[PDB]
Design a protein around this motif. Structure first.
Motif, mmCIF file in Angstrom:
data_model
loop_
_atom_site.group_PDB
_atom_site.id
_atom_site.type_symbol
_atom_site.label_atom_id
_atom_site.label_comp_id
_atom_site.label_asym_id
_atom_site.label_seq_id
_atom_site.Cartn_x
_atom_site.Cartn_y
_atom_site.Cartn_z
ATOM 1 N N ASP A 9 50.146 -22.208 72.214
ATOM 2 C CA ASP A 9 50.524 -21.384 73.346
ATOM 3 C C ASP A 9 51.210 -20.095 72.883
ATOM 4 O OD1 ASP A 9 50.807 -20.518 75.873
ATOM 5 O OD2 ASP A 9 52.185 -22.087 76.561
ATOM 6 N N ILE A 38 47.432 -21.022 82.581
ATOM 7 C CA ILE A 38 47.983 -19.679 82.641
ATOM 8 C C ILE A 38 48.211 -19.220 84.088
ATOM 9 C CG2 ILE A 38 47.534 -17.290 82.105
ATOM 10 C CD1 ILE A 38 45.927 -18.204 79.696
ATOM 11 N N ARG A 80 51.719 -20.990 83.662
ATOM 12 C CA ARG A 80 51.920 -21.811 82.463
ATOM 13 C C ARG A 80 52.649 -23.112 82.776
ATOM 14 N NH1 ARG A 80 51.448 -17.030 79.600
ATOM 15 N NH2 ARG A 80 49.676 -17.274 78.144
#
Ligand SMILES: [Mg+2]
Ligand SMILES: [Mg+2]
Ligand SMILES: [Mg+2]
Ligand SMILES: [Mg+2]
Ligand SMILES: [Mg+2]
Ligand SMILES: [Mg+2]
Ligand SMILES: [Mg+2]
Ligand SMILES: [Mg+2]
Lengths: 219, 219
Positions: B52, A117, A121
């Motif tokens: 995700d 993150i 990402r």
RNA sequence: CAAGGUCAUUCGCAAGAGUGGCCUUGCG
RNA sequence: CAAGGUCAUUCGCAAGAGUGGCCUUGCG
């Protein structure tokens, strides 16, 4: 603070140190910001890294070999071994709890979600940080991989081959406090009978099964 | 050619067309080069793509909600729906097989592993191709997601709450040919008992349980 | 996600394999 | 990987939560 010390082990610097702290915080220590959701995302990320390698280097690529091996390489037991290099025990934040092998496994996974993150990402970069730290360990673990069938499975496969029958397991007794139980199970196939005991039915059914296997390897 | 037709759908061109052919080939059609191993890798890649998204857009982030939902979003049932857009039935290579919902499911997964690999193992690019094609469908399904508990679970949760006891199921009879069996099961809790039938004990036990819920909530 | 037995069916000289159904075991 | 009951324990006025053990359910 001392986070800077963990960033050095990882070889990565966060832009949002609050993110890194979340990965390290258990529910008991903070009801609002803890690692539970990041662990969810971490599971996927890491499972994917492991699988990526497994598929490239495994010696045997049979479904029956790959699944058992992948299951181990992705297990808590295995993440505790990889997490040693990082000394997570000194960074984790927990209130009145004891940093067990379950916690570590979860922070390990959460830590990788955290870097993913934080890196905007970026999956390749994170896959790179991970390999830079664990490929060797994983590659060797794979090199010496071995499917270790449990007694119940073994026994069941012997009796089905020999007689086309499955053993029976019956509970003989239970004793002790509810938080401290002891089970005595009986395994039986044909006229052969054996007992087994353990902290649970399955553990006891297992012990009983190993003894029946040897009881048959002899009869 | 025709695989060029598939590449247009995916929106990506292979450098190694034979890899693409691999993802489309079932074992019966070719014993040497088929999709089994790719599906293994594809499983992880996609799992990671769905997770995700799930964590960013899921309305509820409780583990009890996210697990069921993740279970659905990566299931065969869901891949067949996403795969419709690709018309895989016309690209898949099968020898005397029938292109079932299971085959499609595996080729779907294998197709994305094949893109990943041919892409030089670029997980970002592959994650983007995947999204360009399915983010909307996925975001929608997530938006309307709902945990749908089965009868056995519901029932067991009713008896434990009210009496702190679980129902018991027992086989009453078995009918038919081995490749076509009909089971009749009995569910009981206290002095309440009901029957259920289906193509397996499990299905039979479910119907049995559904009726027990009805019997109870009514009585 | 894997493992074993079994029924039907397809391929095969056989070995073996594919597909569908059932029983059971393990792991998560 | 989730769900429910229970025992022990820690926090709590309680509600409820954490940790460990056991029974069971579902999905893969
Ligand atoms: Mg989890
Ligand atoms: Mg895990
Ligand atoms: Mg975990
Ligand atoms: Mg597979
Ligand atoms: Mg899958
Ligand atoms: Mg599959
Ligand atoms: Mg499978
Ligand atoms: Mg869990």
């Amino acid at each position: 603070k001392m986070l800077e010390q963990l960033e050095k082990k990882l070889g990565y610097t966060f832009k949002d140190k609050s993110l890194l702290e979340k990965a390290l915080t258990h529910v008991s220590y903070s009801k609002k910001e803890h690692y539970e959701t990041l662990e969810f995302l971490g599971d996927a990320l890491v499972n994917f890294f492991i699988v990526d390698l497994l598929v490239q280097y495994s010696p045997n690529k049979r479904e029956g070999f790959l699944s058992p091996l992948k299951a181990y390489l992705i297990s808590e037991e295995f993440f505790n071994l990889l997490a040693q290099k990082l000394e997570l025990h000194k960074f984790i934040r927990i209130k009145r709890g004891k940093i067990n092998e379950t916690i570590i496994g979860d922070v390990f996974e959460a830590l990788w979600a955290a870097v993913y993150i934080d890196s905007g990402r970026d999956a390749n970069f994170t896959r790179e940080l991970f390999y830079k730290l664990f490929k060797e360990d994983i590659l060797s673990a794979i090199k010496e991989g071995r499917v270790k069938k449990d007694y119940k499975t073994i026994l069941q496969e012997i009796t089905q081959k020999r007689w086309k029958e499955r053993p029976e397991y019956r509970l003989i007794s239970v004793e002790g406090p509810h938080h401290k139980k002891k089970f005595i199970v009986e395994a039986k196939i044909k006229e052969y009978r054996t007992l087994g005991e353990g902290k649970s039915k399955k553990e006891a059914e297992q012990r009983a099964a190993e003894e029946l296997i040897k009881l048959l390897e002899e009869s």
